[PDB]
Design a protein around this ligand. Structure first.
Ligand SMILES: [Zn+2]
Length: 194
């Protein structure tokens, strides 16, 4: 609800890092507002571990900490002439997101950039790679293709987990879509948030 979103925006004021230089500040605010949909327990767990959600005004590999990715072809992306230089988001041990690239198809396959990448960090930092736990692996074996992208989401449980989390928290449409397609994944995320 409207007041829950504000509470999470408060929590995020100590998580989000805005970039140097000029950019669409309203769009950066929109991304923070979408992150505020995430259950506050997760956001405070990220803050406890000093995970920073970096909004970028340039390319991922323009940041010194990601320079090692310059020229690197992502897993599964060979032959397209695109590399990490072109990838708008990264999540796991860190989180970095190009402002403006939230929507599906803006250089990435996720329903929403910032929720997908932040799900990676929650998975890895907060929950000890729960996407590789025995329980989620069983669910992934049954439902891992049911969000589509069968040769990507259907192959990597960490990507299926991240995408399912994004569906669960993006909006009411994507939440009910997850419930219909991946009922056991939806219940798993419900029990995790409970
Ligand atoms: Zn991913």
């Amino acid at each position: 609800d409207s007041t829950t979103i504000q509470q999470n925006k408060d929590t995020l004021s100590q998580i989000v890092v805005f970039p140097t230089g000029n950019y669409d500040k309203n769009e950066a605010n929109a991304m923070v507002n979408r992150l505020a949909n995430i259950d506050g327990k997760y956001l405070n767990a990220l803050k406890q571990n000093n995970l920073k959600i970096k909004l970028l005004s340039g390319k991922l590999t323009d940041e010194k900490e990601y320079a090692y990715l310059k020229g690197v072809v992502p897993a599964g992306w060979e032959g397209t002439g695109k590399t990490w230089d072109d990838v708008p988001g990264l999540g796991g041990s860190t989180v970095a997101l190009r402002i403006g690239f939230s929507n599906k198809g803006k250089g990435h396959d996720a329903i929403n950039l910032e929720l997908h990448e932040t799900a990676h960090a929650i998975d890895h930092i907060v929950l000890n790679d729960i996407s590789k736990s025995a329980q989620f692996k069983q669910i992934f074996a049954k439902e891992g293709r049911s969000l589509g992208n069968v040769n990507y989401l259907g192959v990597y449980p960490e990507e299926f987990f991240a995408e399912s989390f994004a569906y669960y928290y993006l909006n009411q449409d994507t939440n009910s879509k997850l419930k219909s397609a991946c009922p056991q994944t939806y219940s798993f995320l419900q029990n995790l948030a409970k």
